[PDB]
Amino acid sequence: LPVRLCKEIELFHFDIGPFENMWPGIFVYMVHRSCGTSCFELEKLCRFIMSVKKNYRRVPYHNWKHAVTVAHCMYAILQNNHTLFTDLERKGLLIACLCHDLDHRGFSNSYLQKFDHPLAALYSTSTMEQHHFSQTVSILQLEGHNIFSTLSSSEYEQVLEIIRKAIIATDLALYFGNRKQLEEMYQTGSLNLNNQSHRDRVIGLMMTACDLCSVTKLWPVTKLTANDIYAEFWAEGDEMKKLGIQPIPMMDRDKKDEVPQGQLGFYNAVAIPCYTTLTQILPPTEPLLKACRDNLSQWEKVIRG
């Protein structure tokens, strides 16, 4: 509600700030403008949000701050393509984003598999993501926490299906296949948002874009956020070493100095193609791609000196 936030929350590169106790208010604000005032009962929406907060952990990157950050990117996409999405899709995608990393420990799917963690035996594919969806369902089942109580059953199942597909798509491993399919479909003209499978893929791509949105922030934010990502990655690399396994340089603390190149390779191979394809499908998402290109060239500048 403060004047500066009302204005700057509409910008794609908004940063939600260091005051944790304001992020919940920021979130309800976004869903009030996106969905409307009558979409959720306020008391139980707030109860739901605080439970979701309580179930994110104190890890350097995959934390409560990141959840609210991803939800804001989704908000900025919803508000600049306000004409495309249904009542349920708007409700569902903000909530999905807010819950998409629920109960993350700071470890990748491959570390869970190599450790032989219980979750890996339960979910052979997209381990952490299936857990994220499972957590969000458990939180919905808590007394007083079903923010979708007012929906019909038919509509309730639709929004839970919107949420699971969305959360599963944040598995970056599914992104490469998804982006590639959408590229061929956009170029040939077969792409069609009235086709549910096509729509599901666009939403999948949107989730990636939001998930990766630290690369679309202004340089100082992107740069500082990078410390948090690597602190988490290196901790995992340490744990690989403890299992007797040489981790990839990405996660290896001893290769700090190759970070500038490593990021460069990631922007070219993952980030630019993601927002390039997204901007093609939804042209109003242009500023995300613009800001991505700016950070790419900032990383190029770190290589030189």
Ligand X SMILES: O=C(c1ccc(Oc2ncccc2C2CCOCC2)cc1)c1nc2ccccc2[nH]1
CB of 130 or CB of 277, closer to a copy of itself: 277
Task: Give the SS3 label for residue 170.
Answer: coil
Contact 104, 59 (CB under 8 A): yes
Cα–Cα distance for residue pair 63/83, rounded to 1 Å = 31
Of the candidates 212, 231, 214, 216, the one whose C-alpha atom is nearest the C-alpha of residue 270 is 212
CB of 85 or CB of 175, closer to ligand X: 175
Contact 209, 39 (CB under 8 A): no
Which listed residue (28, 151, 172, 231) binds ligand X by CB under 6 A?
172
By the rule CB under 6 A, 60 interacts with ligand X: no
By the rule CB under 8 A, 186 interacts with a copy of itself: yes
Contact 209, 278 (CB under 8 A): yes
Cα–Cα distance for residue pair 8/13, rounded to 1 Å = 9
Cα–Cα distance for residue pair 239/253, rounded to 1 Å = 11
CB of 39 or CB of 168, closer to Zn ion: 168
Residues in 34-53 at the binding interface with a copy of itself, rule: CB under 8 A: 34, 36
| Polymer length of the chain | 305
Cα–Cα distance for residue pair 90/159, rounded to 1 Å = 9
Min dist. Cβ of residue 82 to a copy of itself (A): 6
166's contact among ligand X, Zn ion, a copy of itself, none, with CB below 5 to 8 A by partner kind, is none
CB of 187 or CB of 268, closer to a copy of itself: 187
Cα–Cα distance for residue pair 94/266, rounded to 1 Å = 26
Look up tokens 């956009």; give the residue.
186
Q: Which of 62, 131, 132, 145 is catalytic?
A: 62
170's contact among a copy of itself, ligand X, Zn ion, none, with CB below 5 to 8 A by partner kind, is Zn ion
Contact 176, 214 (CB under 8 A): no
Min dist. Cβ of residue 166 to a copy of itself (A): 18
Q: Which stretch binds ligand X (CB under 6 A): 85-93, 120-128, 161-169, 252-260?
A: 252-260
Q: Which amino acid is at 201?
A: R
Cα–Cα distance for residue pair 234/257, rounded to 1 Å = 13
By the rule CB under 8 A, 161 interacts with a copy of itself: no
- Residue 62 annotated to the active site: yes
> Is 62 marked within a binding site?
yes
By the rule CB under 8 A, 287 interacts with a copy of itself: no
By the rule CB under 8 A, 25 interacts with a copy of itself: no
Of the candidates 64, 103, 60, the one whose C-alpha atom is nearest the C-alpha of residue 233 is 60
265's contact among a copy of itself, Zn ion, ligand X, none, with CB below 5 to 8 A by partner kind, is ligand X
By the rule CB under 6 A, 218 interacts with ligand X: no
Cα–Cα distance for residue pair 177/258, rounded to 1 Å = 28
Min dist. Cβ of residue 118 to Zn ion (A): 18
Binding site for Zn ion (CB under 5 A): 101, 170, 211
Q: Which residues are annotated as a binding site for a divalent metal cation?
A: 66, 100-101, 211
**Residues designated as active site:** 62
Binding site for a copy of itself (CB under 8 A): 33-34, 36, 82-87, 186, 189, 191-194, 281, 283-284
